[PDB]
Amino acid sequence: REIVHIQAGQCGNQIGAKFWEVISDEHGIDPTGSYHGDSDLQLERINVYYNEAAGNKYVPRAILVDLEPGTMDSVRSGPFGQIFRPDNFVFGQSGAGNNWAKGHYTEGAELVDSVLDVVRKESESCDCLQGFQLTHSLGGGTGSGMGTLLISKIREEYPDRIMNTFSVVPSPKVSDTVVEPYNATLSVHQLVENTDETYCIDNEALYDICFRTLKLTTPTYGDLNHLVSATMSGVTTCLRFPGQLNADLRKLAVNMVPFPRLHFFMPGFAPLTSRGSQQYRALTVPELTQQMFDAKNMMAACDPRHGRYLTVAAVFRGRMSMKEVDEQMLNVQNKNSSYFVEWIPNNVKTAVCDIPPRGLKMSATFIGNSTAIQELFKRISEQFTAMFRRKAFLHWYTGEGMDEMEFTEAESNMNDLVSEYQQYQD
Template sequence: MREILHIQGGQCGNQIGAKFWEVVCAEHGIDSTGRYQGDSPLQIERINVYYNEASCGRFVPRAVLMDLEPGTMDSVRSGPYGQIFRPDNFVFGQSGAGNNWAKGHYTEGAELIDSVLDVVRKEAENCDCLQGFQVCHSLGGGTGSGMGTLLISKIREEYPDRMMLTFSVFPSPKVSDTVVEPYNATLSVHQLVENADECMVLDNEALYDICFRTLKLTTPSFGDLNHLISATMSGVTCCLRFPGQLNSDLRKLAVNLIPFPRLHFFMVGFAPLTSRGSQQYRSLTVPELTQQMWDSKEHDVCGRSTAWTLSNSISHVPWQDEYKRSR
């Protein structure tokens, strides 16, 4: 079986990752104790992609959870599916990164990275045929951006022929007021261009607008944004978790979607999106769903003009090669 190893880092990454596993467990018929309670053979046909089967028929997520402070880990453990994770796969420090990319990448994160890599190696050795890694993190904080990109670069060195998929949450002043978020994101994007194979771009501002305008939530919370992201992640990974012909693994997904290796930043759309009050009055058809998917208002990332500017700027990053040739 072609397994995927899931890694979540930082406060944002762990909160989104916890919601993701709640959704995935529900889709595969796994309860909060890790036991299968489903009613369809399709639910467990490819369950080994994301789960290890332990003794007594329990299914354990193939996940590594890391952070530079213990608070997030405690909240994940006390969550509805907190007992499903393997206890040894929680790796955390005590100091925190303080929204500082350099702390996560060079100091506190660098001290903890060997412990994380040990857990990653153990999980990778338990796989029959590891197809790649899936990293869930934000680019605005210190741990998810700094230590997250450090881990991605270390994994790229150790597993150069495995695929690397990231779910990266880009910052926005609408959702947070941390002044250093743009610097953290800029430093992280450079690392993602070099070391990631596929990057699902999730924009906090677009998610906030979807919750406010489409879902009619007057004061969207981080829980609302995380729920939207987890539903999107579940939809993106459906082709990897269930039997099918199209995009059945990470490499096929990359072959079908990436025109040039460095241009691997994907804009994610999700449909249908309707407010709770209007769901019972609508009967969506296939043309309506298709129209919603291509509507920029339903994308979990910035508007088309901004995204085009972003992709253009990323495609011109190879200034380093020109600089080396000039020397």
């Protein structure tokens, strides 16, 4: 029944800053820590993410990890940085510098032991864990590097808990680190087989949505990470709150994974349009389904109609009829039958929660597992190869002891995921 969340890397720490904000919004918990809500449900299932400390203080069940105090400090300095206890800030001193080898292989490795100890302390604080969630970037040093290391140890300690992670996937246009594909390649090599599932977030796609449908001209990462948190929070609240359908994360995982190795997801979100049009929108189930199916409302820079859909999850929040939902999902399946895989009859699955997100009447979360995902892997693998041949920045990595044959195997493994998507693309 409970979940532990660990954030890492500057990305992960800033995403989590919005995530937790939202969760407390959902439950009426004040930036200082106490509960000042107003709904029974708000406290009722609070356990999944909060420990109530003496005084009616709620402690977010999460660990903030970094290798630079300053980022942690900036998190702590805002509202909701006060709700986190000092003991959840685990950090070192001297960066990682966006270096996998430092993060995973060497220096960051050193910190992980202290992180894990706190993890253990929290695992004991829970009655019964459902699982763990981690937030991070695929091409980052602590985000992926150190984060991955941690994941391998947590999974080891808890094989029976859900291990998932959401991660920022290097967008085709904006890479920061020259070896960002290298770090990503290494994380695939480690993560894929050490996780139950991973979500693919593309900032470029997010920037398109924010202007494309939301028509906004000023977003920052906090605004885009709001959208990220909308999908993350969407998933777990249902599990928390009363609904109609089947509201268990593990069951979601079961329904979305047809094969042990292909567990990559494309998140999307509805409704998600500018205020101008809000006066011209109608709120129906087909309306949400139109926004959910549309590739432009995906947060991943993929194109599901290019690939084939293996699995689709449609999560609904708010009062909807069962009939309408059933029929519209069927219609989707029918009309987009050319994209769905024939091996899975009725490949579109649903989940229904009766609690709407604060401020909306209804909402829906799109989760997909298509073959289209392989295109991201292909882009990375290719870029990787070029760098691999030149050893760009690999003296930094090999200087910290990372061996090229390990990287070679990592490359293969990327290619293996692509070939397996092809194996089920048919």
